[PDB]
Amino acid sequence: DDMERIFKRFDTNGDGKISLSELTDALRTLGSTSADEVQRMMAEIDTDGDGFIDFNEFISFCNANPGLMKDVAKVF
Amino acid sequence: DDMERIFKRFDTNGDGKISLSELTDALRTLGSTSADEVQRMMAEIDTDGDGFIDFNEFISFCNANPGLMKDVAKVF
Ligand SMILES: [Ca+2]
Ligand SMILES: [Ca+2]
Ligand SMILES: [Ca+2]
Ligand SMILES: [Ca+2]
Numbered sequence: 008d009d010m011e012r013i014f015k016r017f018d019t020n021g022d023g024k025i026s027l028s029e030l031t032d033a034l035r036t037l038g039s040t041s042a043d044e045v046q047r048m049m050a051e052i053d054t055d056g057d058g059f060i061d062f063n064e065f066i067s068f069c070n071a072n073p074g075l076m077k078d079v080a081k082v083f
Numbered sequence: 084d085d086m087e088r089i090f091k092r093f094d095t096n097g098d099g100k101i102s103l104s105e106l107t108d109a110l111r112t113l114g115s116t117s118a119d120e121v122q123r124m125m126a127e128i129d130t131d132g133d134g135f136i137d138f139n140e141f142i143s144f145c146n147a148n149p150g151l152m153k154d155v156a157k158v159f
Contacts, residue, residue, distance in 0.1 A: 037113060065086070
């Protein structure tokens, strides 16, 4: 039920919908991550285990997560 | 495309790979995103365009992006 729990973390007032202010506030948290949380994210994408994300790995991750380039990237 | 563009933007020292520090900076950038930029991300996920992301829309995004959700779980 992790997905529902994550949704609940985003939906501050619990009215069943994530607003602009709620999404922005949630992103603010994602950008204040600890060194170890970043390492955990690195482990997920660093498939060849060299400690870095090369372009092959980035492309592979994007192909498995179309929302990264179609949704999240629209931020940058 | 935006893939190569985004990769390059965060590969600070241009060695072709994203390090832990560079990934940390990318996350902090995402975290300091203006509501205006966040709005573009929200519009992509907000399928019915009511200005909010309901659970159904949130679920669809999660299902299509198992990798991103794993990263999010590192925080939420
Ligand atoms: Ca809400
Ligand atoms: Ca690697
Ligand atoms: Ca680099
Ligand atoms: Ca909606």
